[PDB]
Design an enzyme around this catalytic site. Structure first.
Site, PDB file in Angstrom:
ATOM      1  CG  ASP A 165      -2.084   1.010   1.185  1.00 60.31           C
ATOM      2  OD1 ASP A 165      -3.039   0.876   0.377  1.00 60.31           O
ATOM      3  OD2 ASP A 165      -1.921   1.999   1.984  1.00 60.31           O
ATOM      4  CE1 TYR A 175      -9.205   5.048  -2.413  1.00 60.09           C
ATOM      5  CE2 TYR A 175      -8.372   5.702  -0.264  1.00 60.09           C
ATOM      6  CZ  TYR A 175      -8.171   5.110  -1.504  1.00 60.09           C
ATOM      7  OH  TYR A 175      -6.944   4.608  -1.808  1.00 60.09           O
ATOM      8  CE1 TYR A 196      -4.910   7.222   0.463  1.00 64.05           C
ATOM      9  CE2 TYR A 196      -4.561   7.294   2.842  1.00 64.05           C
ATOM     10  CZ  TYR A 196      -4.879   6.593   1.704  1.00 64.05           C
ATOM     11  OH  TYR A 196      -5.151   5.281   1.934  1.00 64.05           O
ATOM     12  CG  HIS A 233      -6.110  -3.055   0.502  1.00 60.27           C
ATOM     13  ND1 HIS A 233      -5.309  -2.526  -0.473  1.00 60.27           N
ATOM     14  CD2 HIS A 233      -5.767  -2.484   1.674  1.00 60.27           C
ATOM     15  CE1 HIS A 233      -4.481  -1.624   0.102  1.00 60.27           C
ATOM     16  NE2 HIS A 233      -4.741  -1.580   1.418  1.00 60.27           N
TER      17      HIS A 233
END
Length: 321
Positions: free
Chosen positions: A109, A157, A240, A298
């Site tokens: 990730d 998201y 992010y 995931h």
């Protein structure tokens, strides 16, 4: 038969101050070539609990990090502290202070994104690189990150996560509910991640009291709960919030290939980081090897731990050791 796991209290816990206000925590097990495991969002060194013993038994010295923003590592509030340039330079200093000329870097990730940039910009410090789920996509210096994100619906998201404080309030409201809602097999999903912005959150249409996934125990969930009581979700989410900065840094690579030994492992049922996103990575990474895990969503390391361990050890033995 689940692989051996880890009991936090039974591990060696290490701490390195990379800058005056930034201390990184890790656990360490084993002897052999150094292998640094880098988790994703919103995880922990403990996300690697099924890999750490296996890799140490296979003859590797495992360093499983709490990434910056997480667990016992520092979690400064500033967004720019979590851009890839800052995070990568801190991992270089980490190796320097440990006295490691290089390490194998294995990420998942967001940690997968960081290991690709480590391999890209600091290959002399990276003995070999592997990513679970996260592909290596060269930056497009004529497309803005806003446009790329907005071009792919499954990345909505990520817009929701942009405004500081908003997603934090949702994710911190009930930590058990947060982890039990997120850590689920692909077929057990309670999240749509479609128009989450529109809907007003991740969990607005999810159960108030979710069942426990087949992948995790209550005790495991409660370890995550306890870790995120330390600093919460600001630092994690800040990973992010650097899309433009990260794109500008990535553009400075442009041209070059990654010439070190590399492994890309895809997960059939990750519906965000989809296998197809990795197509043609060999154009930029000439020594790339691949793995693929079927029936895997995931949360690769806990969904299919035996398969992950088999893939990593086979590759480490052939390409890193």
């Amino acid at each position: 038969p689940l692989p051996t796991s880890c009991n936090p209290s039974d591990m060696s816990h290490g701490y390195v101050t990379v800058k005056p206000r930034v201390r990184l925590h890790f656990v360490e097990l084993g002897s052999g070539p150094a292998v640094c495991l880098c988790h994703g969002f919103p995880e922990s060194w403990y996300s690697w609990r099924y890999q750490i013993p296996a890799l140490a038994q296979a003859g590797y010295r495992v360093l499983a990090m709490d990434m910056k923003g997480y667990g016992e590592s520092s979690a400064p509030p500033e967004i720019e502290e979590y851009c890839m340039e800052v995070l990568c330079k801190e991992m270089v200093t980490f190796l320097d202070k440990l006295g490691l000329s290089q390490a194998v870097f294995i990420g998942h990730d967001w940690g997968g994104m960081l290991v690709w940039y480590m391999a890209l910009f600091y290959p002399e410090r990276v003995r070999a690189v592997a990513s679970l789920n996260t592909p290596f996509i060269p930056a497009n210096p004529n497309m803005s990150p806003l446009e790329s994100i907005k071009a792919n619906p499954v990345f909505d998201y990520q817009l929701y996560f942009q405004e500081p404080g908003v997603a934090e309030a949702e994710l911190e409201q009930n930590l058990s509910r947060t982890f039990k809602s997120l850590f689920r097999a692909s077929d057990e999903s309670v999240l749509s991640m479609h128009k989450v912005c529109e809907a007003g959150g991740l969990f607005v249409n999810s159960p108030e009291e979710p069942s426990l996934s087949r992948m995790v125990t209550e005790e495991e969930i409660q370890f995550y709960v306890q870790q995120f009581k330390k600093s919460g979700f600001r630092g994690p989410l800040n990973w992010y919030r650097n899309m433009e900065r990260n794109w500008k840094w990535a553009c400075k690579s442009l041209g070059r290939k990654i010439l070190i030994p590399a492994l890309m492992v895809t997960a059939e049922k990750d519906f965000v980081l989809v296998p197809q996103m990795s197509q043609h990575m060999e154009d930029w990474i000439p020594h790339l090897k691949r793995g693929h895990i079927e029936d895997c969503g995931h949360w690769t390391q806990m969904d299919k731990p035996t398969e992950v361990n088999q893939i990593l050890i086979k590759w480490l033995d052939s390409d890193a050791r």
